[PDB]
Amino acid sequence: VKVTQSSRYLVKRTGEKVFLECVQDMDHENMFWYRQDPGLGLRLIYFSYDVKMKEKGDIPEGYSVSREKKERFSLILESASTNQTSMYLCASSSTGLPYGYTFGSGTRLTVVEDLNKVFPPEVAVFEPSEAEISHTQKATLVCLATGFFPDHVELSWWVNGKEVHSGVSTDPQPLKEQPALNDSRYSLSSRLRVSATFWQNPRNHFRCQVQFYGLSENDEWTQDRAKPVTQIVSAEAWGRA
Amino acid sequence: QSVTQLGSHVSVSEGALVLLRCNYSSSVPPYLFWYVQYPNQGLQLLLKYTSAATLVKGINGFEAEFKKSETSFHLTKPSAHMSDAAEYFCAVSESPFGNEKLTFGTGTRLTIIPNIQNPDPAVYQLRSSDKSVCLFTDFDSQTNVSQSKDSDVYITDKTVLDMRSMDFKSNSAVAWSNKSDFACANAFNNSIIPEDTF
Amino acid sequence: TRPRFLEQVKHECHFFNGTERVRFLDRYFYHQEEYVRFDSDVGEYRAVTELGRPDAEYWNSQKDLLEQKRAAVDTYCRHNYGVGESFTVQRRVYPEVTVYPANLLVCSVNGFYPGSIEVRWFRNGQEEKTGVVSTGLIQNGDWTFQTLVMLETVPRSGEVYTCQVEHPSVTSPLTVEWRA
Amino acid sequence: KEEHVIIQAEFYLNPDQSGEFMFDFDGDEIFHVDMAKKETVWRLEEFGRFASFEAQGALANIAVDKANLEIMTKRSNYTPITNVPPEVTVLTNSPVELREPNVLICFIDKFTPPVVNVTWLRNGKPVTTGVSETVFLPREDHLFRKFHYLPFLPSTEDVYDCRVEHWGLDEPLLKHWEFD
């Protein structure tokens, strides 16, 4: 019982025609498209209850769909605008089934006016303060992902090759390096706090990893710098006696 | 049909009472749903009202009571746990199984404030980047970190990290810059404990 | 021409004395044959013919499925009854009455609703209970009925013939008399 | 002792790819959904002034019936439906009086599958102006009924015929009517 959406992330330029895919192999008759935005919840864009059936949801303006095969329900943005930047969620179900919605993994889509404004983030780790170690018997490492745009990052901490969650706290949101600009780059920080003993072990390896989702293979690029494609950036550090 | 969730952001101290509001409008037999979205995860069905019972008990310790008279379906939990921090969504549908279009509320972000048992206010300095970063940590849950007074100085909001293995929790914020004059002594120059160390 | 295949489904709500007693049926048909059904007086789906056994076992094995159907008398039937009660259960349209010869004397009662009606023939004040032929209640398919009640007699001078129609739409008997 | 019955009846037919969704109250149609225009068509305009129905829902049930038909067609080893010819009757709305507006009612009953060709004929020629009809109405025996109407001004000179074609009839059926 799974609903799969084409991409997890996408960057597109204004005016472009964008296609978001949704496919399910459960022979479900009903498929819907919702967009999720902070403070607005989930708003229904379009839905379909059968092949070739299209029904405007509560916010159809700017979008269109297509349901040619039962398995697929495509969402279409004719002339992408920045306000269509959002998290798109697909859902499927059957009126003839004893249960409800089955959501897809979602699709983060950011519409920007200028693709040349896209940049991968730089990553740097900062080792614990000796003072903190002495004063509390603990060691806080800090990770800084800076200079990226748009806000398509996933930061993770790995200790001795194992992804860690306990002791971590990543900022819920980035901060603009130049708040005034609407194309400004972002910066994100995170902390990994371990025991002083653990940090004082030269055998323990710490790594801050950030996956960035930028331009795709299809995107054209001729600028001098490296194409800002989706990529993993990271920094590391070893315990210090 | 419609639903409203009065209160977009709700803060609750752990062990305390959790209450998330949901009101609806329906000219047909109502079927309500409460979904939860834990960080970095997709929506999960918490519980639902099918008219089989007025008091619905859900997973993860949650509860909700359908009140036709108040046209409400509030989500409640007696004791807040740090792992309840998430965004909660209320939804209404005309179908008994929620398999036909659902109408979602605006959602509520639930933040759990931990009781810092051993406050220990402090601003530390840490050391490839043209920056140097300062860490303000271990303050009690009433200290508020203001935004930087300088536009070339970055200060994040405060966040909590939890060391499960040691049943320990701490609050922190980070400031950094590349200006020469920027020193950890004055970085958080916006209302901190007189007690905090250096 | 080529073979045809028909599928039908009937969700029925039977009301007795208003909504005091309500029975719900979820019926499934292949062509003209019912193969599986849920009867609210039974509580679970039952195969009507061997063809429907698969569906009975399948649907009955899902607690949530049966739960929803068991609550249909309320979430469906009672709700819908209340929705159209004013223009259905309470619909009232007067019987149009016309008496003409044909040897027969015909009393045509047209355009009335509901359907239950009483049509009686009289002669000089005395009811004619023998030699009365009714075509029965005829449904016009537009929320109105009609019926023709004939009296087998040979119309004569001095004789007074009366058609008396009783119907829920009328406060008192409607009569139309005919004389030769 | 029964009192009222509400039925939500639906069907899907292959190869015609035709589906129907409607509500019935004691034998009369309350409304049906026009699958094409995706809207609710009330049997009597008045009904639609007091009630409403989410038409799109009909499409969701219909889509399940399609899937169900395929499932049942295979379960029965492609056993086709057996054609049952219609019984046809023609009558008027009320007593006929020359030069007075009336309505000819053509009643098609007890047949399946739900596919028929109905044409009104006046003096041998087809008539379409002012004619109307109902969708296929459910019968308790799971066959179907249907009504076609023709408003008209009675004349001594006009002759009418209701012509009905059905795969169950070896030849078209013609039911005749004329001012007696």
């Binding site: 009126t95 003839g96 | 000219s27 037999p29 | 979820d26 698969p54 569906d55 469906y76 | 989410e54 499932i71």
Partner: peptide
């Protein structure tokens, strides 16, 4: 007032 439809179940495959 608003009429509500009853769901049609999907058969066993």
């Amino acid at each position: 007032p608003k009429y509500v439809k009853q769901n049609t179940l999907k058969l066993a495959t």
